[PDB]
Each structure stands twice: as C-alpha cells, then as structure tokens.
Design a protein around this ligand. Sequence first.
Ligand SMILES: [Mg+2]
Ligand SMILES: [Mg+2]
Ligand SMILES: [Mg+2]
Ligand SMILES: [Mg+2]
Ligand SMILES: [Mg+2]
Ligand SMILES: [Mg+2]
Ligand SMILES: [Mg+2]
Ligand SMILES: [Mg+2]
Ligand SMILES: [Mg+2]
Ligand SMILES: [Mg+2]
Ligand SMILES: [Mg+2]
Ligand SMILES: [Mg+2]
Ligand SMILES: [Mg+2]
Ligand SMILES: [Mg+2]
Ligand SMILES: [Mg+2]
Ligand SMILES: [Mg+2]
Ligand SMILES: [Mg+2]
Ligand SMILES: [Mg+2]
Ligand SMILES: [Mg+2]
Ligand SMILES: [Mg+2]
Ligand SMILES: [Mg+2]
Ligand SMILES: [Mg+2]
Ligand SMILES: [Mg+2]
Ligand SMILES: [Mg+2]
Ligand SMILES: [Mg+2]
Ligand SMILES: [Mg+2]
Ligand SMILES: [Mg+2]
Ligand SMILES: [Mg+2]
Ligand SMILES: [Mg+2]
Ligand SMILES: [Mg+2]
Ligand SMILES: [Mg+2]
Ligand SMILES: [Mg+2]
Ligand SMILES: [Mg+2]
Ligand SMILES: [Zn+2]
Lengths: 36, 172, 206, 58, 143
Amino acid sequence: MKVRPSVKPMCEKCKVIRRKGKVMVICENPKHKQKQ
Amino acid sequence: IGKKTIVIPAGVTVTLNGSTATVKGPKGELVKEFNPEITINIEGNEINVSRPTDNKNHRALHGTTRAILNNMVVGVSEGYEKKLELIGVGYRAQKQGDKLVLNVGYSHPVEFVAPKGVEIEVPANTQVIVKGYNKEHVGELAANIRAVRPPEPYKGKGIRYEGEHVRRKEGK
Amino acid sequence: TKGILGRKVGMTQVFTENGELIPVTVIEAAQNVVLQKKTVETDGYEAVQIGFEDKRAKLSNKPEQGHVAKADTTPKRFIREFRDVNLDEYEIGAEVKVDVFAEGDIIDATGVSKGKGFQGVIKRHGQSRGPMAHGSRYHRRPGSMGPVAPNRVFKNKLLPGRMGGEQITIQNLEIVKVDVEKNVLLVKGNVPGAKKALVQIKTATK
Amino acid sequence: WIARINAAARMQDLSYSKLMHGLKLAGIDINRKMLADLAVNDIASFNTLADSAKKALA
Amino acid sequence: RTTYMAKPGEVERKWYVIDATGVSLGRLSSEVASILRGKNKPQFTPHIDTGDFVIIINAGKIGLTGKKATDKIYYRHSQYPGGLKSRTAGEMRTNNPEKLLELSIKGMLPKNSLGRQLFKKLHVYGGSEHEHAAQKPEVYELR
RNA sequence: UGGCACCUCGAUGUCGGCUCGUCGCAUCCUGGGGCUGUAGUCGGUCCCAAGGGUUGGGCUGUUCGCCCAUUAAAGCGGCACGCGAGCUGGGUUCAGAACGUCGUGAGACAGUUCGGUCCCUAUCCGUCGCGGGCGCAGGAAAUUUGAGAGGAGCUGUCCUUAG
RNA sequence: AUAAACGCUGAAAGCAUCUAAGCGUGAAGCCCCCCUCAAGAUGAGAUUUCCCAUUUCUUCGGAAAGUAAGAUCCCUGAAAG
Ligand SMILES: [Mg+2]
Ligand SMILES: [Mg+2]
Ligand SMILES: [Mg+2]
Ligand SMILES: [Mg+2]
Ligand SMILES: [Mg+2]
Ligand SMILES: [Mg+2]
Ligand SMILES: [Mg+2]
Ligand SMILES: [Mg+2]
Ligand SMILES: [Mg+2]
Ligand SMILES: [Mg+2]
Ligand SMILES: [Mg+2]
Ligand SMILES: [Mg+2]
Ligand SMILES: [Mg+2]
Ligand SMILES: [Mg+2]
Ligand SMILES: [Mg+2]
Ligand SMILES: [Mg+2]
Ligand SMILES: [Mg+2]
Ligand SMILES: [Mg+2]
Ligand SMILES: [Mg+2]
Ligand SMILES: [Mg+2]
Ligand SMILES: [Mg+2]
Ligand SMILES: [Mg+2]
Ligand SMILES: [Mg+2]
Ligand SMILES: [Mg+2]
Ligand SMILES: [Mg+2]
Ligand SMILES: [Mg+2]
Ligand SMILES: [Mg+2]
Ligand SMILES: [Mg+2]
Ligand SMILES: [Mg+2]
Ligand SMILES: [Mg+2]
Ligand SMILES: [Mg+2]
Ligand SMILES: [Mg+2]
Ligand SMILES: [Mg+2]
Ligand SMILES: [Zn+2]
C-alpha cells in the first residue's frame, strides 16, 4: 500500500474507487495499491 | 443497463408483509427486511420492482433489492456451493460427524463446525465443499475456511478456490 | 466459593513430606455462625452475613442483641459479608467450620495492615535521598513540587502523612493443613495485620 | 414587560411580533407597561385588544 | 411605581409528562428548558421560580441526526493529571439515556443558584414507566 | 542561528548535576498490518498504536561527543533551556596574583592559570494527612449498594512441537 | 465494541467493486475483569435491629425540662497514635 496525496492510476488496468470517503486505486498488481 | 424481470421457476412460496418479505422453497425459510421507500410487486409467478424517486439514493437500492430477491429465490430452488482444494504436502481434511478438522502445518489442529443452514462435506482429504441455500453464509464460511492458510506465491501451498490466478514468483 | 473469619495467631514453619521447609501462618477460626441472608428480592444483591466471636453480654447492646437473637445465638464481635457465594447452603444460625477447606485449596487473605504513624516520604513512598556529603544540605526531603507554569501543584504529589492501616488483600496463596478439632488453619505465607488481627479467608477469585 | 406580553399573547395563537404589528396597524397606542398590566390582571381586556389586533392584520 | 412582582408559592406549579420518541435532542431540550424556567406565563418574574415540573419518558429513543451517534464526544476531567475521559453519544443513549438528556437540558439553564434549583424539577426515564403517579401529571404536546 | 524592542532596571537569579515528575507523538522496544529487488533466519519502507518500559562506567564544569561492558530498547521534544523561599557551586560574572599578546602609560583581552560569604520563623491559594460542626423532616447500633475516582498494565532465556 | 487491515453478499454503472442499504473477522490500545477510596452522590441511597408517643407553658406556628434506646465526661491502657 502506498499512502500519498497524489493517488493516480499507474497502468492500463488500475481502477479508482472510493471507500469510506477517501480515494484509492486497486490493481491486480499488488505494487499498485494506493490510498490517500 | 437493466435490472428487472424476476421469474419464479416453480414451487417457490413468496409473500409480502409490510416492509418485510418471506420466501419458502423446498430447502429452507428466508426472511429479511427492506426499506419502505422501494416498491415491490407480487403475482403468481413474476416479481417486479420500481423506483418512484429515481435518484442516486434510490437506484442502488432498487438494484440491490432485485438482486437479493433473485438470490433468495434461486437459493431455495437450485442451491449454492463453493469449491476449496488444499495444495501442498501434509494438508489433509477429515470429518468428525458434523465437525471439520484441518492439518495446515500448525502445532495444533484447527476445528470448523458448520452453522445452521449449511452442510460441510469432504469428498477426499485434499478437497472440500460447502453447501447451503443462501449465497452469503456459504461464501462467508468458505472464506473463513480459506483464511486459515491463504495461498502463498512462492510454491503455491495453501487453501484456495478452484478458479483464481494466484500470482507466482521465483525466490531464488 | 467459601469463606470464614479468623484471628491471626502467629507465624511458624513446617516440614513437607517431600523434605522441604516452608513458612506458614496460623489462623484460628472458632465460633463463627451465619446471621442473616441477603437476597435480590429484598436488597438488590446476594450475600451471607457471618459473625465471628462470642462476647460478653455486658459489652453488647439491645439493637445488636436483638439482631443476633433473630438467629438464636449470642452477640458476636466481628460481622462481615461474603458475595459470589451460593445461598442454597448456609441455613440461618448454622455454624461454619474450617473443614469447608481442604489441603491444597487456593485462597485470598484480607486484613488491615500494621499501623505506622506519621511517616516521611522515604519510608512511605520509597523515594531516594540526596547526597549526604560533598556540601549538600538535602537528605530526606520530598523533591520539587512541580514546574512554574501551572502556578500550582498537581494532585498525587506524594508527601508525608499517616503511613499504614489500610485494607490489603493478597491472593493466590496456598493452604497447607487443616485441624478441625483445634479450629486452626495452616496457610502458607504472610497475611496483613498484627497478631490478634481479623483475617477474612475466602476462595481465590482467579 | 416584553417577555410578559409575549407569554400572554402566545396563548391567543400570536407572537409578540405579530401582535405589536397589528396594534400599530390598528391605530392603538398603548405602551408595553399598560399592556403588561392588562396581561397580568385584566386578561379579558387583553384578549379584546388581541382580537382587535387580529382584525387589523387581515 | 406599579408593576406586578410574584411571590414564592403564589403561582401554581403543575406537572407534565413529555414523550421523547423521535424528537431531536436539542429541539426537545429547548422547549423543556423554557417550560422549567417559567417563560410561558404572564406571571414570569426573573428573580423567583414560577415554572413547572417536567417528566420525560422514552428517553432511550431520542433522536440524533447525522453521524452524531458516533462522532459526538462527551468529555470529563477528574482534575488529576492526564485524567480526561471520553464517551460517545450513541453509547450514552444505549446505556444512560437519562444522563444524556440531563446534560443536554442542564446546559440550557441559567448558571446560578436559581438554575440549580430549576434543574431539580426534571425527571428523566429511559422507559415508559414513571413513579410519580401520585402527582397526577398531565400530557404536554410539543410546540 | 537570527530580526524587532512590546512587559520587567523602587531587582523576573544564570550553565551543568541531584531530588521529583508530568505532557506531545514526528514510535527506540514490545502489540496489529500493507508492499518488497520478502525462499528460511535476518532485513528495507510505509500504516494503526502513547499501555508499560527505556543501563552501569572512563575523559571533560560540561550540554554534546568519543570509548568500555551490557540490553527487548538504550526515542525525539515541551513545561521561565520544568524544578536554587527544594539542594550543590565545578563553569560564567566581584575585589589578589601570574603567563602570552596589545598600549609610552594607568590598564585591557567570547585567551589561559591558582584562590574566592548562596539570607528568610509560611499570611492566602495549592498539595499530603488528621479532627470539630451542622445537614441528610423522630432518636440510636451495626452491615452495605455504588454514581464517581485512584492503582496496576513491562519483558528475557531454556525445553517441546522440530532439525 | 473498535483503529490500520482482510473479506462475504451487492447495486449505483447488465460487467467489475469490502459500501451505498446489510453481515464477519481484527491491537500491549478503548470499556469491562483485578486491587483500593467512595452517600457532603445537599441526587445526602438500602437492609436488619432497638426506644417510644411524658410533663409544663404557648395567640397557632412554637418553646423548655426531666428521660428511653444510646453515647460521653473521668480513669487503666495498646494491636493505635
Ligand atoms: Mg508522485
Ligand atoms: Mg541515590
Ligand atoms: Mg548537612
Ligand atoms: Mg491558574
Ligand atoms: Mg527568539
Ligand atoms: Mg518604536
Ligand atoms: Mg530588568
Ligand atoms: Mg516591588
Ligand atoms: Mg502516528
Ligand atoms: Mg512495531
Ligand atoms: Mg511489526
Ligand atoms: Mg511514556
Ligand atoms: Mg580512576
Ligand atoms: Mg522528557
Ligand atoms: Mg524560575
Ligand atoms: Mg532552566
Ligand atoms: Mg541550576
Ligand atoms: Mg523556585
Ligand atoms: Mg567557583
Ligand atoms: Mg586583579
Ligand atoms: Mg611593551
Ligand atoms: Mg584556599
Ligand atoms: Mg582547590
Ligand atoms: Mg576558578
Ligand atoms: Mg521552611
Ligand atoms: Mg466530619
Ligand atoms: Mg464506578
Ligand atoms: Mg464529586
Ligand atoms: Mg499508571
Ligand atoms: Mg469481536
Ligand atoms: Mg485484550
Ligand atoms: Mg442513609
Ligand atoms: Mg501486653
Ligand atoms: Zn496498475
């Protein structure tokens, strides 16, 4: 998990969602997990 | 787009009481509540639902109501099951009547008891199945069984479903 | 759960069958009777009331004499209550014997400590002295009372005062030997209080 | 006086604001002291004045 | 000159029972505080007590809009260093509804000896049963 | 480290150590997790977490720093650089004397060196203990519920599971 | 009961998705459990037992003046100070 103020997609299969009112991306590559 | 046209196959007893609901089939009894703000329709063999408000806070509820009515109808008719297989040396499974045992490389056996409405049967020491008539309980019990020893990417040893692409590495 | 009341007789040692030598404290528990029974329909909680020693009718007064006469006995000197106990036993006026315990049970001891008078902060709270040479003029004093900013001194600033005499319970404390005929109870270790104190013995909570 | 008049006029289904507006609009020029006196110990006359104020508003 | 000032015991003080099912906490407390103060009578004298007695039932169903049931905190300090304690509003509604209502109403009364006398006229029950049937209270409807 | 010169020159005592602590979290240890260029043992990085814990000496007045031997660890900061009507007085910062240097000189030097008076019976609040009075709609003797508050809260090594 | 986190079912957005309605796990931390104080908690609580309804005056309100249960003055002391 990467905790950044600058969450954004990192490849062509990343996906951006919202959980409990905060932006995060999820990918099948675990290196791409991000959350604000 | 499209979230309508529920069809009752056969032998399914569905009734509506206030904001509640009640479904009976050949398997078991399922009862649960719904918000009054949604609209439910009943006749001999078809179910329909409509959203009067038609906004964000109501379309999702319309969809989920349709989905879980479909789930309750199909569960008592056809049933639900999940597939778990154990990979690696020394991983077995035995059934002590209505009780499940697992040897997953720990210094103490781990015990699982199937709650009401679900049945755990073990065809072979290296493969198990869970049965039931609602998706939620069966899925959650299978998830709890797998969570004891989830798969690991280096060799693949662990408990896993039959249809996931677990990632693999080298680890020289 | 069981319980009796007794007096601290003394302090001694015995040899076990294994061979080792252990210290024990002797407790005499004669003449204690069940006085009153408290119920949840009448009081809000369940308890038993026990009285320990007979005392002369010269020393007792009419209220307590009627209270003890309600259970057909003579006035008692110590009266206490036990909770977490089963009310099915303990008929009113029945006596409690030391044989309610057996060799090997784990108990709790409750009593009032020995009294130390107005004691300083080094005996009372275990502080540290200041240097006693190298020109120092600070030996057995409390310390700094705090910073400057609050314009005051906080609470729990430990200071001299009356030291001992509080209720103390020490727990998980094994029993060694029971003598029914002499009404004594040999229990391994220390218990709070001076000699002739009241000791309240009861089954370990944990 | 204002608090007392407000309390007495809320029992006629009227605020202090509406009652004062109606009294000004009807032409009555009684100060708050006399109105508070009437509210305390001549409640019938106070109700009469409140009725007149209601008439003026509509 | 001539302005009416009430005297102790000169004004009748009645009893009311108020059902608190579904009403917001502050919106109920404001009305109750006005009733206790005595501001609904044309006999209102600021320096004495002319208000009524209030009984509140069903305090366990009081309403809390928004996320107040979890995000509103009640703080205490024991005046010992580091002795601050917290408690959320939903927990108190579940466990001590009476104390929740009492804190809410007490914050809205004057902060003097008369306010301390007025606070003693409020009885709050978490259920629907009260023990003051001897006073023959009436039903009060909000607004 | 500075800038300003707003309170204090009819006096707001200064560095280090001792006694006594309390608070913040930007967490040193212990607890729970995500990613790994994570085979295991050991690590790196980030996330939640302030409950407890966080060593004894050699040199220097020293803070700091280096070193010795340990430890699960030897956290960073605030409180008048916390704490002198609680202590010390080694340093700085009084009168004596000497060195190097500057000055014609009397003398001077964030250069050095040896020696150099640390006053006070606690009124009010505050803190720690202990009593008298009245109240609690009659006067007494015991046994108690518990709103509320304080305390405690740490952690190693060995054996087995198992080479 | 939760924090970070991991999930089940599930639409908005025919798919996907731990969240939007609804469920389950989850920390030396929070609230309990453990030890002590605690009804001046003026919101002054509860139980068991004991004494009883005297005499003078009062404009009622009320006052004094001998007592009951009980306690103390005074005296011998320590396990307390
Ligand atoms: Mg970037
Ligand atoms: Mg020392
Ligand atoms: Mg000395
Ligand atoms: Mg202050
Ligand atoms: Mg500065
Ligand atoms: Mg200027
Ligand atoms: Mg100055
Ligand atoms: Mg001055
Ligand atoms: Mg943090
Ligand atoms: Mg950690
Ligand atoms: Mg860790
Ligand atoms: Mg700490
Ligand atoms: Mg040496
Ligand atoms: Mg510090
Ligand atoms: Mg100072
Ligand atoms: Mg300082
Ligand atoms: Mg100093
Ligand atoms: Mg000082
Ligand atoms: Mg010196
Ligand atoms: Mg000189
Ligand atoms: Mg020269
Ligand atoms: Mg000398
Ligand atoms: Mg010297
Ligand atoms: Mg010197
Ligand atoms: Mg002094
Ligand atoms: Mg007292
Ligand atoms: Mg409590
Ligand atoms: Mg208090
Ligand atoms: Mg502590
Ligand atoms: Mg749980
Ligand atoms: Mg725990
Ligand atoms: Mg009482
Ligand atoms: Mg003797
Ligand atoms: Zn990606």
